[PDB]
Amino acid sequence: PRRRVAAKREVLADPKYGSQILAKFMNHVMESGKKAVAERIVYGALDKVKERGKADPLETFEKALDAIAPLVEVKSRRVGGATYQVPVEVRPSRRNALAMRWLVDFARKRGEKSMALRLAGELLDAAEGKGAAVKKREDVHRMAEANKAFSH
Amino acid sequence: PRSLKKGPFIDLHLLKKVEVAVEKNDRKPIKTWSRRSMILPHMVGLTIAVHNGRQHVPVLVNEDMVGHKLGEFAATRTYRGHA
Amino acid sequence: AGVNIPDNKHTVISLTYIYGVGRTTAQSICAATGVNPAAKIKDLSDEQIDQLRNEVAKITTEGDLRREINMNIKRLMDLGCYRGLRHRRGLPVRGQRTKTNARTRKGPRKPIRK
Amino acid sequence: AKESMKNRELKRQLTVAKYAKKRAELKAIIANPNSSAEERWNAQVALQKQPRDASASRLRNRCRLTGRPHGFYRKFGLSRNKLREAAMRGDVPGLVKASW
Amino acid sequence: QIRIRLKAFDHRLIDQSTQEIVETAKRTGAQVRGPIPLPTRKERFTVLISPHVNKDARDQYEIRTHKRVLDIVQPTDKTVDALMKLDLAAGVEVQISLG
Amino acid sequence: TQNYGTGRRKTATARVFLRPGTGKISINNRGLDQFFGRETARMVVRQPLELTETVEKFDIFVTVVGGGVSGQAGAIRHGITRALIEYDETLRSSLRKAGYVTRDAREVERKKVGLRKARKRPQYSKR
RNA sequence: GGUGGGCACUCUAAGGAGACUGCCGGUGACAAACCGGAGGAAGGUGGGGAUGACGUCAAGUCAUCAUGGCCCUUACGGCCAGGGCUACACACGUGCUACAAUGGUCGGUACAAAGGGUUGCCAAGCCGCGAGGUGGAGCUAAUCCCAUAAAACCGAUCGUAGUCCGGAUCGCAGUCUGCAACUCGACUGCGUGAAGUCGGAAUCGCUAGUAAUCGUGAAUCAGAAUGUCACGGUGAAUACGUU
Ligand SMILES: [Mg+2]
Ligand SMILES: [Mg+2]
Ligand SMILES: [Mg+2]
Ligand SMILES: [Mg+2]
Ligand SMILES: [Mg+2]
Ligand SMILES: [Mg+2]
Ligand SMILES: [Mg+2]
Ligand SMILES: [Mg+2]
Ligand SMILES: [Mg+2]
Ligand SMILES: [Mg+2]
Ligand SMILES: [Mg+2]
Ligand SMILES: [Mg+2]
Ligand SMILES: [Mg+2]
Ligand SMILES: [Mg+2]
Ligand SMILES: [Mg+2]
């Protein structure tokens, strides 16, 4: 807000893989304060990924995020009769959080049996870049480039 | 429901009036204000004018109302229909 | 078998479907005569299916239960007590609100005049 | 908070304290398992013989200064809007404004 | 072996009373074990402050009850009973046991 | 010999004794794995040892009271940090950099008058 | 810690210490001040509370109380028995419970804080499926009672169905308080099993131990809380910025 007074809060507590991104994803998949349930869900999804194929789950997860984080975003501004949607390069910190949120959001509506399996399926699909999340990402990019006349 | 440690509840005056009136069989409704009272099995066939809230309405006692209470046979609110 | 009992289900859960036996009653039936409620009735021998039939034929099922319930309802209906009068207008008979929120006994919303 | 209200409620606790003991053994006889109905019914009719305005459950306590039915605190004897007056003047011992 | 219990609504005068009883306890030459601070009760009330409808208009009060425990060994001269009038004056409640 | 430490976190208090040994680890006369069952509590309680890399050298005796699982774990970590400082008083810098000796003073905010939770409010219909 | 015992600790509650831009670097009208760093449990009024300037809205209260005038004085004053404030074609405000698989049941086990109790709490044992009943111990309470915390963790099952989801409504049989549970109490057992598949226009709270979720206590009170006031367990996302 106007003050610019609140600095960031750092918590880094990966229990069995020693990765910060995994802990942040556990934060994203959490609901109503269930830390341990989220850890179980994430570990089950990674174990399903490990069992399905020879690929190790951590690298698959990381390169699935790298194939889903958007590059530019659309932000609206009115001028008194029309609101134009200018593109802005997403900050290096925003892209990771946006990717995680999109991944978990489209995992929640995947439609198959359990949340662990839904995450597993989404990670497998995103590692190759064919899920609904990558469709959303490319939609965002095409919308942003279609409004490149404003850019500034 | 009343505890079965004391099943029957009956007002003393109404009880004695009914159990006195049994000698001369049903000839006039017994007017009363005690809706809390429960029908005794031994008073069947006699008519009781129970208080409604402004007047006393008459009820005739058969076997299928022994375990109930007097107040259930005198409705206190009217509601003759909204329209 | 039974009266259109649903198969491919655990014994107690399927037994629940008989309108007069719930969950404690179904497991009581399963316990009175030795059967495993973990076993699907699809896999139970007739020599014990008829045993469950004998156990179920002891209390009440379907037609007689509805008959006695309706007899009680009609008795209340025709006595003329407050319960009967409240029970013939299609209104809650146990003292709940009627100013608002008595929708399960009053069905749809059904507006007001025009 | 009329005068009649206070007077009649005062008469109520006076009448309750009048007997205040026969209720005890009457209810004990009613509630006693090894009592038999023969004398338990007699205790019932004896209990119902007493005036109706004698039970403890008919006592509705009011403010000792205004006779107000609502807003009562039983640690003190006063109501909602006189306890504040007594406390803020320092009359009530031990009571202070608390933050914690 | 006697037991001494003190209660008060505030700590100034109960501390003073504890100090004076314990110094009188040394005076007779009896051993003493120090003052035990017991947990203090705290009872709270919330009261509406308007004569009519304002529910969030509330004021909150509390009462604190302080306790202290003392005991002595080998007594011979008991003027504490003979000074009971002076020992407790205004707002200190004193209990004695096993005299 | 031996060293003492006390830890406090989220109304959870912990007494920690450091002795020479081979990391027996006892909490309320029962084992660590039997105390914290398959969660991050083991790593978070273990960190102040590998940060100073003396996990094998020290046997640890622990008594705990109050709070929940996470508060208990944080209190144990704080107590072990303090005792370890009391043992080898030159490694203050490492634990300060890790932010281990800093006692977190966050507590449960008191409920307010006119509010449901500490900050939640009714819905404020304006008409 | 059952005992002797100790006064280490924890804790309890009184007295004190500590954080004040104090020291260093830079910016600054070598002023106030601003941005950093060290030390430290805490750094920039550390966190939370209480405390509401002159006045405004002829704001609210004559029904807590007090008070000027007016009004009733065989009634607008009193006592009693019943009924009503609990009605019900409908509209609105505030909440609880759900619509499930981050879940529902069955079994095993771990960890709190605050508080109430001698016209009171009301144990152990025994009897009931259960509400509950007998019993009488201890406690004027850091001692006895309320009084097993729940979510979490471990194992099995249910496999996407209006269902082992959801519990409304209704029938039968009961317990307790109370002179008295019909109008019109709260809980228990058996059966029944409704709408509900995440909600149009619109709209609300929240910046960290916060929101979200899980339990516990108290006042009022014979009996009667999804309300109010409090206590802890687990425990986030986001803030580029001021068009
Ligand atoms: Mg007057
Ligand atoms: Mg009352
Ligand atoms: Mg520092
Ligand atoms: Mg607090
Ligand atoms: Mg609104
Ligand atoms: Mg700064
Ligand atoms: Mg600093
Ligand atoms: Mg104020
Ligand atoms: Mg006006
Ligand atoms: Mg007005
Ligand atoms: Mg009356
Ligand atoms: Mg009302
Ligand atoms: Mg169910
Ligand atoms: Mg704010
Ligand atoms: Mg809380």
Tab-separated table of N, CA, C and O (backbone and C1' of nucleotides) in Angstrom, chain G residues 153-171:
chain	number	residue	atom	x	y	z
G	153	C	P	-2.931	-36.309	9.363
G	153	C	O5'	-2.112	-37.172	10.421
G	153	C	C5'	-0.709	-37.014	10.567
G	153	C	C4'	-0.132	-38.071	11.474
G	153	C	C3'	-0.413	-39.511	11.076
G	153	C	O3'	0.470	-39.994	10.079
G	153	C	C1'	-0.892	-39.229	13.367
G	154	C	P	-0.056	-41.028	8.968
G	154	C	O5'	-0.286	-42.381	9.775
G	154	C	C5'	0.812	-43.093	10.322
G	154	C	C4'	0.364	-44.342	11.042
G	154	C	C3'	-0.540	-45.280	10.264
G	154	C	O3'	0.162	-46.098	9.346
G	154	C	C1'	-1.402	-44.981	12.440
G	155	G	P	-0.495	-46.457	7.924
G	155	G	O5'	-1.582	-47.570	8.270
G	155	G	C5'	-1.185	-48.895	8.590
G	155	G	C4'	-2.361	-49.764	8.960
G	155	G	C3'	-3.499	-49.832	7.954
G	155	G	O3'	-3.240	-50.711	6.873
G	155	G	C1'	-4.379	-49.525	10.122
G	156	A	P	-4.006	-50.518	5.473
G	156	A	O5'	-5.503	-50.981	5.775
G	156	A	C5'	-5.809	-52.343	6.032
G	156	A	C4'	-7.276	-52.537	6.335
G	156	A	C3'	-8.249	-52.061	5.268
G	156	A	O3'	-8.427	-53.012	4.234
G	156	A	C1'	-8.957	-51.291	7.390
G	157	U	P	-8.811	-52.538	2.748
G	157	U	O5'	-10.316	-52.031	2.876
G	157	U	C5'	-11.371	-52.936	3.171
G	157	U	C4'	-12.658	-52.200	3.449
G	157	U	C3'	-13.163	-51.315	2.320
G	157	U	O3'	-13.926	-52.048	1.375
G	157	U	C1'	-13.206	-50.115	4.367
G	158	C	P	-14.031	-51.564	-0.151
G	158	C	O5'	-15.024	-50.323	-0.094
G	158	C	C5'	-16.377	-50.485	0.306
G	158	C	C4'	-17.069	-49.153	0.418
G	158	C	C3'	-16.957	-48.249	-0.799
G	158	C	O3'	-17.944	-48.543	-1.772
G	158	C	C1'	-16.473	-47.018	1.175
G	159	G	P	-17.573	-49.346	-3.113
G	159	G	O5'	-17.039	-48.216	-4.096
G	159	G	C5'	-17.815	-47.055	-4.363
G	159	G	C4'	-17.024	-46.021	-5.121
G	159	G	C3'	-16.511	-46.465	-6.490
G	159	G	O3'	-16.533	-45.358	-7.388
G	159	G	C1'	-14.684	-45.849	-5.120
G	160	U	P	-17.259	-45.494	-8.811
G	160	U	O5'	-18.075	-44.139	-8.962
G	160	U	C5'	-19.342	-43.970	-8.334
G	160	U	C4'	-19.687	-42.511	-8.155
G	160	U	C3'	-19.363	-41.610	-9.342
G	160	U	O3'	-20.336	-40.569	-9.430
G	160	U	C1'	-18.165	-40.875	-7.440
G	161	A	P	-21.695	-40.796	-10.260
G	161	A	O5'	-22.287	-42.150	-9.664
G	161	A	C5'	-23.657	-42.492	-9.811
G	161	A	C4'	-24.258	-42.893	-8.488
G	161	A	C3'	-25.110	-41.832	-7.810
G	161	A	O3'	-26.445	-41.835	-8.281
G	161	A	C1'	-23.557	-42.714	-6.255
G	162	G	P	-27.025	-40.585	-9.102
G	162	G	O5'	-27.640	-39.639	-7.978
G	162	G	C5'	-28.596	-40.132	-7.046
G	162	G	C4'	-28.088	-40.035	-5.630
G	162	G	C3'	-29.119	-40.318	-4.541
G	162	G	O3'	-28.452	-40.881	-3.414
G	162	G	C1'	-28.308	-38.125	-4.296
G	163	U	P	-29.169	-41.999	-2.513
G	163	U	O5'	-27.975	-42.947	-2.063
G	163	U	C5'	-27.375	-43.849	-2.985
G	163	U	C4'	-25.934	-44.130	-2.641
G	163	U	C3'	-25.627	-44.226	-1.149
G	163	U	O3'	-24.568	-45.163	-0.960
G	163	U	C1'	-24.318	-42.530	-2.097
G	164	C	P	-24.817	-46.541	-0.173
G	164	C	O5'	-24.616	-46.141	1.352
G	164	C	C5'	-23.597	-45.219	1.705
G	164	C	C4'	-23.554	-44.939	3.182
G	164	C	C3'	-22.667	-43.759	3.548
G	164	C	O3'	-23.120	-43.155	4.761
G	164	C	C1'	-21.739	-45.741	4.432
G	165	C	P	-23.715	-41.660	4.763
G	165	C	O5'	-22.434	-40.713	4.750
G	165	C	C5'	-21.661	-40.531	3.573
G	165	C	C4'	-21.599	-39.086	3.153
G	165	C	C3'	-22.435	-38.106	3.961
G	165	C	O3'	-21.777	-37.695	5.148
G	165	C	C1'	-22.685	-37.682	1.636
G	166	G	P	-22.600	-37.125	6.403
G	166	G	O5'	-23.689	-36.159	5.764
G	166	G	C5'	-23.441	-34.767	5.616
G	166	G	C4'	-24.703	-34.029	5.253
G	166	G	C3'	-25.860	-34.210	6.224
G	166	G	O3'	-25.810	-33.265	7.275
G	166	G	C1'	-26.608	-34.566	3.999
G	167	G	P	-25.146	-33.627	8.686
G	167	G	O5'	-25.897	-32.658	9.702
G	167	G	C5'	-27.018	-33.105	10.453
G	167	G	C4'	-28.312	-32.950	9.690
G	167	G	C3'	-29.544	-33.557	10.352
G	167	G	O3'	-30.144	-32.665	11.281
G	167	G	C1'	-29.418	-34.271	8.098
G	168	A	P	-31.589	-32.964	11.921
G	168	A	O5'	-32.620	-32.324	10.891
G	168	A	C5'	-32.849	-30.922	10.850
G	168	A	C4'	-33.844	-30.570	9.774
G	168	A	C3'	-35.291	-30.943	10.066
G	168	A	O3'	-35.966	-29.934	10.794
G	168	A	C1'	-34.686	-31.722	7.915
G	169	U	P	-37.066	-30.315	11.897
G	169	U	O5'	-38.119	-31.202	11.105
G	169	U	C5'	-39.099	-30.607	10.269
G	169	U	C4'	-39.917	-31.660	9.567
G	169	U	C3'	-40.645	-32.638	10.472
G	169	U	O3'	-41.884	-32.131	10.923
G	169	U	C1'	-39.487	-33.829	8.791
G	170	C	P	-42.409	-32.480	12.395
G	170	C	O5'	-42.888	-33.993	12.282
G	170	C	C5'	-44.003	-34.341	11.478
G	170	C	C4'	-44.013	-35.811	11.147
G	170	C	C3'	-44.160	-36.767	12.317
G	170	C	O3'	-45.493	-36.893	12.775
G	170	C	C1'	-42.449	-37.529	10.880
G	171	G	P	-45.777	-37.222	14.319
G	171	G	O5'	-45.612	-38.803	14.419
G	171	G	C5'	-46.615	-39.668	13.911
G	171	G	C4'	-46.201	-41.117	13.983
G	171	G	C3'	-45.930	-41.662	15.374
G	171	G	O3'	-47.108	-42.023	16.069
G	171	G	C1'	-44.172	-42.284	13.938
